[PDB]
Design a protein around this ligand. Structure first.
Ligand SMILES: Nc1ncnc2c(CN3C[C@H](CSCCCc4cn(Cc5ccccc5)nn4)[C@@H](O)C3)c[nH]c12
Ligand SMILES: Nc1ncnc2c(CN3C[C@H](CSCCCc4cn(Cc5ccccc5)nn4)[C@@H](O)C3)c[nH]c12
Lengths: 232, 232
């Protein structure tokens, strides 16, 4: 066969700190393109862990580097997100079934919001990996929700923008990287799963909530991602 | 030494059509990551030409592929842009001295607009290449302006947004790819030059102006880019 190569991504250092700790193996640090890639071996799999830095351009770059420079065959994203829906509470886990770039606007040419020519509004993630997540969550009695994640280059902290994301895209959560990660994976034909744990409610108090819950929510997502890797 | 490898990028097919025609050499078409790369030889240089598709994620991906998969040592971008200033008229050429992602908003954490932690508001391009552009333009009696280009994932078509770009960033032109291209190049240590020819005034009539002038403005930029490659 060959050794399975798995890319594991967060956006912030804080999102990968628990990943590195939970896997508990020795990592070689490899610098490339302004990122540091942590390369280790775990259960007949080569794991490549990195944080991209915040936002769409950073995450697009890092995902592309993982695929081209490190030859990863799957990409799993773990991090935190803002909730857009009452039933997604602080610390809850969501797997993204589709993602959208919510800040894309070519409406001057009568395109729907989120749409770019030669692409699509919604980007799909891996059905087989999302099925695995649901199977594991049910076995461990973990509430795992699934839904649309909206990604953009703004930290959302207003009722008005939240309501737009729900009305326009039927999104359940908001972040700044998932859509770009999933997009790159789609372009290269690489299976992708995007996991997020809720850190805030994307409202006027979101900054304070985020600062309070980043560590715990990052750990929650990281722990679940590790449980998926254990089944690959 | 080794043969010099030069990446040449546009955002739309229409921006690279004149590039391919003007170089007038045979190109091998190579598919990778949802892009088609046109690889040819020109004056002891290997030229790799592609259009990224529109926007920040597309252009980030394609630039990263050029660098990692095709080993380019310089990246020259050619295309069209909206003017933000009275002295930049339809068809005029601008070289970007710095670029900004104008739609980035982490103001909830008291960051200035355009700023992301572990990055900067303004991304620099290559002084040596920008000096070459100015030298050539002066020899050929071509008006070449220089200034800040703002990039975002929206087509700008309003007085209100234009004025924001000028007030916030002192930008001279607006487009959807330059900042992401220049950013990737900065992260990999690859010299970058971003050239744009004006297609519209980024106002309420911008869509109609763009459709009218895309071909001519794309050609103007392409011709100038070729004149730079002739001096590399
Ligand atoms: N309501 C919401 N809207 C949009 N996205 C989210 C997220 C998910 N993440 C989280 C992250 C948001 S931006 C965080 C910026 C944090 C920060 C950190 N520093 C200081 C600093 C600077 C450089 C290096 C290290 C720290 N200054 N600002 C960004 O990566 C997106 C969760 N809730 C969201
Ligand atoms: N005022 C302005 N604001 C922002 N950017 C600009 C630009 C520069 N370019 C140009 C380009 C803008 S988006 C163009 C979309 C054109 C289009 C083309 N099609 C049909 C189509 C679909 C698929 C494949 C081919 C054609 N539907 N829409 C995008 O690449 C940015 C010039 N003026 C600007």
């Amino acid at each position: 066969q060959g050794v399975q190569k798995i890319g594991i991504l967060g956006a912030m250092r804080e999102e990968i700190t628990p990943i590195l700790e939970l896997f508990g193996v020795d990592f070689e640090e490899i610098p490339l393109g302004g990122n540091v890639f942590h390369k280790g071996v775990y259960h007949n799999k080569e794991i490549i862990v990195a944080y991209s830095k915040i936002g769409k351009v950073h995450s697009t770059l890092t995902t592309t580097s993982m695929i081209l420079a490190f030859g990863v065959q799957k990409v799993l994203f773990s991090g935190v997100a803002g909730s857009l829906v009452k039933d997604l509470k602080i610390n809850d886990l969501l797997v993204a079934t589709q993602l959208v770039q919510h800040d894309v606007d070519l409406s001057a040419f009568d395109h729907p919001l989120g749409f770019i020519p030669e692409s699509a509004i919604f980007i799909e993630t891996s059905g087989s990996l999302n099925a695995l997540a649901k199977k594991i969550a049910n076995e461990q009695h973990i509430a795992l929700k699934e839904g649309v994640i909206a990604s953009g280059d703004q930290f959302v902290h207003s009722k008005e923008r939240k309501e737009f994301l729900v009305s326009e895209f039927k999104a359940s959560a908001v972040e700044m990287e998932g859509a770009s990660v999933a997009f790159v994976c789609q372009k290269f034909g690489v299976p992708c799963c995007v996991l997020r744990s809720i850190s805030d409610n994307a409202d006027e108090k979101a900054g304070m909530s985020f600062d309070e819950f980043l560590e715990k929510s990052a750990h929650t997502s990281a722990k679940f991602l590790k449980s998926m890797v254990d089944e690959l």
